[PDB]
Amino acid sequence: GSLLDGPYQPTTFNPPTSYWILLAPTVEGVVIQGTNNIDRWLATILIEPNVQTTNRIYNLFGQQVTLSVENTSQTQWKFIDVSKTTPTGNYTQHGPLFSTPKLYAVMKFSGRIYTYNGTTPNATTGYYSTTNYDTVNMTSFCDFYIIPRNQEEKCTEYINHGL
Ligand SMILES: CC(=O)N[C@H]1[C@H]([C@H](O)[C@H](O)CO)O[C@@](O[C@H]2[C@@H](O)[C@@H](CO)O[C@@H](O[C@H]3[C@H](O)[C@@H](O)[C@@H](O)O[C@@H]3CO)[C@@H]2O)(C(=O)O)C[C@@H]1O
Ligand code: NA
C-alpha cells in the first residue's frame, strides 16, 4: 500500500518524529521497548487470549522483570504498555488495547510517546509525556512498518481492521 513503508526487520533505532511505527507481532511477549535514559522507560507486552491473572517474566531492557498480567478476553489479544519513571522503580500498566488484527503502533510526537488503546475495531490513542522525547531510541522485537502522522486515520484503520 502507498501509505505503508516496509516491512522492516526487528531493530534498534531512533524513530522519526510524527511517524507511526506499525508493529506486527506473532507470539506473546515483549513487542517493543524504548527509553530516554532520564525518567521514562516504556515497553509494550502482548498477552494471548484467555489468560487468568498470573506472574510472567519479561526481558525488559536486558533484565528479567516479573509482572502480574491477565487477559479476560476469549477472542482478542491484549497489548499493555508498561512504564517506570525511575531506573530502580516498578513498572505500572497502562493503556491496554484489546485487538483482533494483532497490530500495534507507537509514535514520538510533541514531547510524548503515543500508542493505541481501547478495543478494536474502535481503538483510540493515548500518550506518555516524555522528557527530551526525540532522544528516545526504540527496539522493536517484531517486523514493523512506517506510516506518517498526516494519515493517522490510515494507521487507525490498520489497527482496527488489519492490513
Ligand atoms: C495511556 C495513559 O494512561 N496515558 C496517561 C499517562 C500515563 O498514565 C503515565 O505516563 C504512565 O507513567 O500519564 C499522563 O500524565 C499523568 C501522570 O503524570 C500521572 C502520574 O501520577 O499523573 C496524572 O495526573 C493525575 C494528577 O496528578 C492527580 O492529582 C489526579 O487528579 O489524577 C490525575 C490523573 O491520574 C497525569 O495526568 C502523561 O501525560 O504522561 C497522562 C496520560 O493520559
Ligand atoms: Na496502549
From Swiss-Prot:
Cysteine disulfide partners in this protein: 142-155
Protein origin, superkingdom: Viruses
Covered range of the whole protein: 64 to 224 of 776
Subcellular location: Virion
Function: Forms the head of the spikes and mediates the recognition of specific host cell surface glycans. It is the viral hemagglutinin and an important target of neutralizing antibodies. In sialic acid-dependent strains, VP8* binds to host cell sialic acid, most probably a ganglioside, providing the initial contact. In some other strains, VP8* mediates the attachment to histo-blood group antigens (HBGAs) for viral entry.
Binding to sialic acid, annotated site positions: 40, 129
Region entry Spike head, spans: 4-163
Name this polypeptide is given: Outer capsid protein VP8*
